[PDB]
Amino acid sequence: TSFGKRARTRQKFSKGFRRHGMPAVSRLLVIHKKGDYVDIVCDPSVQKGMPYSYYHGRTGIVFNVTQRAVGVEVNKVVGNRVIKKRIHVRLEHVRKSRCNELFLRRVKENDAAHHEAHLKGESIKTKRQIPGPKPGCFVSGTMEVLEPAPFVES
Amino acid sequence: AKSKNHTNHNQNKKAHRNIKKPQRKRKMSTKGMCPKFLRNQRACKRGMM
Amino acid sequence: VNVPKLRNTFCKGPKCRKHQPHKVSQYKKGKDSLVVQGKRRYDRKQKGFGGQTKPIFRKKAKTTKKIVLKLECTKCKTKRLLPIKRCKSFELGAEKK
Amino acid sequence: GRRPARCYRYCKNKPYPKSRFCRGVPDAKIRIYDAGRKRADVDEFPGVAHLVSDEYEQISSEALEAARVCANKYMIKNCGKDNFHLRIRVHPFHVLRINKMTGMRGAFGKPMGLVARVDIGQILMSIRTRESNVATAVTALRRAAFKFPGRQKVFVSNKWGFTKFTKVEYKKQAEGRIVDGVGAKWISTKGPL
Amino acid sequence: VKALKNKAYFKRYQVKYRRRRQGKTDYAARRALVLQDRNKYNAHKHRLVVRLTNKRIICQVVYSTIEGDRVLATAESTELPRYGVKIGLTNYAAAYCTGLLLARRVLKQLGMSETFEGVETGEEYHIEENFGERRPFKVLLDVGIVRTTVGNRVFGAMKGAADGGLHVPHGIKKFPGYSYDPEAHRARILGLHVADYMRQLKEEDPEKYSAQFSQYIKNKIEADDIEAMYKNAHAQIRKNPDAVRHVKLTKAQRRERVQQK
């Protein structure tokens, strides 16, 4: 086949439908502190600093912040091993990740829950519960008698 | 006398035989950070000695 | 391709270290000469019998060569070589569009 | 010498229609699809019979031409020229390749001719006619089945002409939602006014 | 013929944002102003917003947030009847007086009034001055989509801010008098070009001098008196901060209206 920086991009780098024109200003006012997760989505509208195609849609940790760019460490399988790769990228092509935000909420409630016992002797054992089997109750309402259907061609 | 051009067969099975993940480390490596920034981390560390 | 003769650019030299104007010549090679070690080693080696030693290159692919500009500073007379991309047509006479 | 049509029964390849990429145009043998009286209005010709495939096939353009010339000639003798409409619904857009005569190498081949793809349950022909007829119009499509490959069930539907509407649901016409030939158009309460 | 604006035309049709449709914001120039790098993290880039409406000159200091832009302190030329200047609110003199009157009440809000007196007229000035000490308050200039000529009223209000002691970055090249002449710029601040036009026009005509400048005849201001006002306005400013139908129809109500028609 043929290899180019943007080969097979077509659908992948397409702007979208009715989504043409430049980035909005409020998305350009997002801050990214180092030690923070970000999903690399590249918008073809800006051709400056767009990352390579493989990294598109990859979540990874911000290690640097250049003035007009964000150093993101992502990770990449090469047969036998993962290897952590360090890719700079323009500000428009980075989104804030939302993958961590349940865990970030969770710790504030969970650490405050363990805190507040003190002399009652904590040992709360705070933990999510996976919704397995339901217990039993009586249930009653209006009924219908169904039967199976004869075939019709139409 | 061809012969086969290419194949991905038995390559996933070979890789998974051993897919090592790099060990996590405290304190992030600074290779590829700003030179201006890393100048002031040296000047920082000097000032507390 | 067309290029002006006058040209403001950086002067990598001891006095200036800033943008001066420069004079844009072309760079040609200049003659290969004798008494240079590789030419002397080539001459002793090809004396005698045994035909000739080194490869003679035969089969060129390229039409073009890379155009070097010889810059030359006005004030201090520093020079250097800028390369430029390849082309068949080169000049640095005027006639603008 | 064209091929036997056992060669090109099955839908082995992706559709390859006549475009800017194909360029070799072989032109079809059906450039007359509709037949009988084309111009009759919907208030006449309530009865209908479809010819429906049960089998996932290709059908050549010549086999469609053969089948319509079969069926409309059976109409002309029995029930006259001017008491039927006969549509061919299927079109041949798939273009079909031949390599002709180191054995391979130049294996990719030129475009021979046209062919139509056909699903299970897909409608091939439809005769629209008077309820007087119908039984004659079924036996017009028992004939036309022999020109195609595979089997095709013949199917008297319950619908007035070439419309969505059931012939029960058509006649409740009087209230005047419905008002065009070969197409009963529904007047909506949707506007403007 | 096929005629304008199909059903399928409106399907395809993307919209420009809204303040492009309304015809106000340039989103090209907005993206250049609002960026402040990522080495700075969470600094706020302030900008002076001068807008020439009719009869009035609005002047704001503004930084941006994700919810919206956020005003630090406003100024209006309609305030200036407080500080001596009765009329001539749209002109270049009033633009300078608004930009000065703004620039004090940025400093008074932060608590930085005694530092940065600035430089009271029409001579060139940047703030390289003050060394070994706190740096002057940085603020850009957003013209908007006022077309940027030599003169215009906006660089009046820029020079008002520079007198006030806000660090505006600016070249000299779009001031009046330009190769630069400072005393020609002093004529525009003190309203001398306005007085010289009245001095030219009154000896020529009574009818033009009645038709224009009718408010000047009411408020009793002569050709000689103009340069006194805008000078004396400045000392008045610098001892002062500021001091204070139909409705929709339901779908029951809509099908009611059909059977009327």
Add this chain to the structure above:
RNA sequence: GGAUAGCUGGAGUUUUGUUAGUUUUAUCAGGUAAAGCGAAUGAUUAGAGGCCCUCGACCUAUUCUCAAACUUUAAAUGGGUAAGAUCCAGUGGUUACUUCAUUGAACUGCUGGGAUUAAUAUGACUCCAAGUGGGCCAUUUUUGGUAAGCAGAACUGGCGAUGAGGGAUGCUCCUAACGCUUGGUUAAGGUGCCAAAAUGCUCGCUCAUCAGAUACCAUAAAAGGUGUUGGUUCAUAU
């Protein structure tokens, strides 16, 4: 044919609340299958309604059928990241960086809060070197070709390197993987005889002057039959 990486062995250590070809919880990326054309682009049948005709024109609303290099919309199966002792908060200091500013930023000192913070299972570098770099097959996906026990790919599993029981017989199908053995129980598959086990029980269908008989598999079709056994729906017992 080499070199190089991978697959493999051996020799040393570090080291045990850390690993995963898995799901869940939350969050993203994608443009295949289908669908679409009374949505753009491209292909396409049919008529309707807009100085004497006239098929035209073109327009307006409809209609027949489509697309590997068309698309508004858009699955399943797969892919990324996160789920705490390598953590969270409070407070002081360092700094040529950053700020209009002890404002921030990153790094650090101290003081609290917390022992495994979804499920299930489970202990997790360095060196030296061999052989190998002709592969083939099967289910699904799929390209060239009339097709091939043909050529070329994708995912997984086999054969090759591998016997045992079944498919009469078969490198690749099924069951199932092997230390020497005593007893018990099954798998796939079978029970008239060859042949270990049913001429077992019970209910239908079939008469062949070429019956039929067990996946891969060792070929059969269009079209017929008042041969027989049932069903569906009309019309006067047929």
Add this chain to the structure above:
RNA sequence: AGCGCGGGUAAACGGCGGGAGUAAUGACUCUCUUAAGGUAGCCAAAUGCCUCGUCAUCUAAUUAGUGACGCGCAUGAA
């Protein structure tokens, strides 16, 4: 010196044309082009692809043989 520049030499190596129109046929006219455009002769040849060429002859019957006929794939003058 040679090679260039300028002559000679084919019983030196060798080479020796197409297209329309015109009393079925083309003596004849026109046209593009070569260093020269195959002359005298001979031919389906030990040399002709189409080809078992066409017409005589030998035969009851001849893809053979002989004698003629030539736009001759690709005959021809030490």
Add this chain to the structure above:
RNA sequence: AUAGCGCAGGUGUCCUAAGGCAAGCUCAAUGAGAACAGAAAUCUCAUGUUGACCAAAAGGGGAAAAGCUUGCUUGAUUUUGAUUUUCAGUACGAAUACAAACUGUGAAAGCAUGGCCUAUCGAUCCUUUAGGUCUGAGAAACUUUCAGCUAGAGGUGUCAGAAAAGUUACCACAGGGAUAACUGGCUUGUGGCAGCCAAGCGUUCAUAGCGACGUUGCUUUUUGAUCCUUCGAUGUCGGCUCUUCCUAUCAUUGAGACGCAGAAGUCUCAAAGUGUCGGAUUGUUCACCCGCCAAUAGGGAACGUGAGCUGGGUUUAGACCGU
């Protein structure tokens, strides 16, 4: 991520502007209008989501711009590193994000390290020039020439980079069924044979005999397609001789149908029990004639049959002609 001598195309360039920045403006197209003037000139209004244009293939991207027009300029500059892409996580090339200079444009924010993004290119050795108050020619100075250190250029298109024409039928060696020319095997387009439907032909009448436009099979007696077997050899055409087998039956036996009066036939069923010839030309297989006959049907058995023959052909070495 992913193959084929898969599919549709493209590159070895072009440009001091088509580079850079800022400002102003809006394009293709349609509609209605204006002397000469129309289907096409120029001017004007209205509408115009990109239907134009951006050096060139195709695809992304773009509307107070990335398009068009003007103004000012040379960041297509200098110093070396890091990263991404191919990937062994080597190199080249290409690109991205900073750092330290110095300039351009703009009021300023900014933007600019060539082209809006995706292609447009090259190691060692050798030669060559640019740079330094530089290092060395080893007995020591001076001073030409030389050798160095750093960065470009001269080129390898077989593009990780030898310096390179034929012929062998006089042939040789190591090997290869990884790979052709025979049989056999899979396949059956092509060849051959048999069905289904019924437009017409058949004076009249679709079906005695036929059968278009379509469509379903069979065969391995043709020819391809393929490369599984065989290269430490299975003796490659044709004829002669001799045997057997098949039936898709040319004749002979017994039937049935007819456009069957008789005679002569054409069609179909049971039929392989018996029979299928003499010669001219060609190496022929085929073919084409002369004749006979009840009839001169088609095929298989390693394209039956070379320790059975023959050697005319093909296919060694000699020689002739033509190209």
Add this chain to the structure above:
RNA sequence: GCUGUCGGUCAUACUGCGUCGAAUACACCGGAUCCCUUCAGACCUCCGAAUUAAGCGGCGCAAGGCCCGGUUAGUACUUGGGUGGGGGACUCCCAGGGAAUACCGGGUGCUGACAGCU
């Protein structure tokens, strides 16, 4: 309840056509001496103060568009299993996931900062 300046989401916000807008205020609007712009004071620029018609805002339209839900549909398609069916083409069962038009029931906005107005 509103008007302005800077915005956020970027059509529930667009487009077409028609009626109505207290009060600031936006706006049309008057002028060319200087700053400044061209063929041209139309645009732009500067200096002004003698009608809501448009712009702008609200509302309507059996409007188009757009957004939201119900149908379409447990259908199309599809993951794992089958010594299931079928001569093939394809199709059914078991354990799971599960769309999209067509067509009618409701909508046509919400909002942060700052200065002012019944």
